[PDB]
Amino acid sequence: NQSSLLAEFGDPITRVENALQALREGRGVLLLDDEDRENEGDIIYAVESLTTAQMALMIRECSGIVCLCLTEAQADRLALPPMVVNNNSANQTAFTVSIEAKHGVTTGVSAQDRVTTIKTAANPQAKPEDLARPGHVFPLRARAGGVLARRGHTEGTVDLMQMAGLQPAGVLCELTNPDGSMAKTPEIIEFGKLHNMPVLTIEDMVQYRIQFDLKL
Amino acid sequence: NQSSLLAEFGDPITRVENALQALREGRGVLLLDDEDRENEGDIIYAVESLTTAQMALMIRECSGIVCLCLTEAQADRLALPPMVVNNNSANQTAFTVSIEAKHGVTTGVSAQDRVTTIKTAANPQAKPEDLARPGHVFPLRARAGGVLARRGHTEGTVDLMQMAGLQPAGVLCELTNPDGSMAKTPEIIEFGKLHNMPVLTIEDMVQYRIQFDLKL
Ligand SMILES: O=C(CO)[C@H](O)[C@@H](O)COP(=O)(O)O
Ligand SMILES: O=C(CO)[C@H](O)[C@@H](O)COP(=O)(O)O
Ligand SMILES: [Mn+2]
Ligand SMILES: [Mn+2]
Ligand SMILES: [Mn+2]
Ligand SMILES: [Mn+2]
Ligand SMILES: [Mn+2]
Ligand SMILES: [Mn+2]
């Protein structure tokens, strides 16, 4: 079973603390959602320490639809409307219009360019004119309340950043197997060991956030 | 120089004929745009022969923002508005709202699911309700006139399909190097040799289309 597989990484509280510490150190983590939701694991990085090398890893090992988790306030500051008025996708992932930095990029799609775009968008001083639309970076609006309101990787990302004491902006993308199938827990665990990334679940985060009276 | 590098693949007319034949056979090709435009090479596949294995290759070797080139008529049939009213991106790539099949997929992001979504969308009998929005497939509207009107990989794709006698729907995605940089001509040539894919340029196509009085 899943929790038995993850025991390696420690019990739920340890799995959360280790993830937060990795983020504080500028490393990435792997977040699994509920087995009866997507049963998918996303690579998560903090934006403020994001490197080209981390983005290149995300592009070659994940779906390549690298998303930028933003707060509602930041998405509003950037004047980023939802991509679709009536989102009728299964999970209602809160995709905004896609974005590209106006300055400092070429075609927008290289690892370096995506990082430039992401840092431009996450800048607390950012203005809407800093971003062209559409582009190769896919911002998302996190629900107020984080994983205590919606148990998606989007909310996982913002909560991890806030709980680690970091700026509330992160990047995420679904870990994909070489044959195009999506990674499941055994592959995610092995990837985490290979790349020295902690693994944790949304459930771990919800338990942690509820037990430590953590309002963010 | 570039044309010297591509001489291996034949002269421009041969490069076009070989690409068309590969597509007719159900294989992929590599299309370079102008050196003073993106100077990027995209993998291109015909939709009607698209396999999970071809999509998996695109995801692991390219940007992972796998696009679906549609005619304006097909995009209209699907009720796919442009993602942004005033596209202010550099190349004005005609991204529609992103899509996911309503039926036959799980999370939409696996290689198989993206193919399911693409075939659902490309179906000449498709209806708007067949697709949820947003999703993990990124349709584009090709300009009327193809590469004789706009010299983008979008138009390259639709023109290759029409000239090969295939349904005018293809998938495309930018070839990316392992370190996250974008592949340039030497890397594209080597990739084409490895995967037995023909390489050609948009210029090749424009010359071919103008000399063979090819109205599509
Ligand atoms: O699932 C995804 C997209 O389909 C990715 O993990 C990310 O974009 C967050 O989305 P979320 O898990 O919150 O729905
Ligand atoms: O460049 C791209 C996106 O940035 C891709 O090749 C494709 O989506 C077609 O776009 P195009 O080359 O026609 O602008
Ligand atoms: Mn481009
Ligand atoms: Mn997810
Ligand atoms: Mn609480
Ligand atoms: Mn998803
Ligand atoms: Mn292109
Ligand atoms: Mn003509």
Residue B170: which H helix or E strand, with range?
strand B170-174
- The alpha-helical segments, DSSP class H, found in chain A are 2-6, 12-24, 52-61, 72-77, 111-122, 153-163, 185-195, 202-211
CA dist B99 and A36 (Å) reads 23
CA dist B31 and B9 (Å) reads 12
Q: Are strands B99-101 and B131-141 parallel, antiparallel or unpaired?
A: antiparallel
Contacts of B66 in chain A (CB under 8 A): 64
- With CA atoms as reference, report the closest residue to A92 among B24, B135, B164: B135
The neighbouring-strand residues paired with A69 are: A140, A170
For the residues of B52-115, what is the DSSP string, one character each? HHHHHHHHHHB-S--EEEE-HHHHHHTT--BS-SS--SSS---BB--EEESSS-SSS-SHHHHH
Task: Note the maximum CA span of chain B.
Answer: 49
- CB-CB under 8 Å, A53 with B112: no
Structure tokens at B151: 């010299």
**What is the end-to-end Cα distance of chain B in Å, rounded?**
32
Which residues are CB-contacts of A215 (< 8 A; sequence separation ≥ 6)? none
- CB-CB under 8 Å, A108 with B89: yes
Q: Are A155 and A147 in contact (CB under 8 A)?
A: yes
Integer Rg of chain B from CA: 16
For the residues of A131-148, what is the DSSP string, one character each? EEEEEEEEEEEPPTTGGG
Nearest CA in chain A to B95: A134
* Torsion-angle region of B92 (φ positive above 0: left; ψ -120 to 50: alpha; else: beta): left
- CB burial of residue A1 (10 Å; 0-12, 13-18, 19+): exposed
Count Cβ atoms below 10 Å from residue B79 Cβ, excluding itself. Answer: 13
Q: Which amino acid is at A91?
A: N
CA dist B161 and B6 (Å) reads 22
For A5, B38, B81, the CA distances from B60, given in Å and listed in that order, are 27, 21, 29
Integer Rg of chain A from CA: 16
CA dist A167 and B188 (Å) reads 39
DSSP for residue B183: P
In angstroms, what separates the C-alpha of A106 from chain B's closest C-alpha? 8
CA dist A33 and A200 (Å) reads 9
Which residues are CB-contacts of A133 (< 8 A; sequence separation ≥ 6)? A80, A97, A98, A99, A100, B83, B84, B87, B88, B89
Experimentally determined by: X-ray
Structure tokens at A171: 């990047």
A193 C-alpha to center of ligand 1: Å?
A: 23
Residue B192: which H helix or E strand, with range?
helix B185-195
Residue A90 domain boundaries: 1-216
Nearest-atom index, ligand 1, CA of A37 = 12
B52 to chain A, any CB pair closer than 8 A? The answer is yes
The neighbouring-strand residues paired with B155 are: none
For B45, B62, B121, B156, the CA distances from B145, given in Å and listed in that order, are 20, 27, 22, 10
Q: What is the dihedral of CA B52, B110, B67, B192, to 10 degrees?
A: -50
Q: Which residue has the tokens 């940089």?
A: B181
Nearest-atom index, ligand 2, CA of A108 = 4
For ligand 1, whether the C-beta of A67 sits within 6 Å is: yes
Structure tokens at B145: 């006139």
CA dist A53 and A40 (Å) reads 23
Residue with CA nearest ligand 1 atom 6: A153
Annotated binding site of A: 37-38, 42, 150-154
CA dist A46 and A51 (Å) reads 10
The total of structural domains in chain A comes to: 1
Substitution candidate for ligand 1 out of B105, B109, B110, B138 with most atoms within 8 A of CB: B109
φ and ψ at residue A135, rounded to 5 degrees: -165, -155
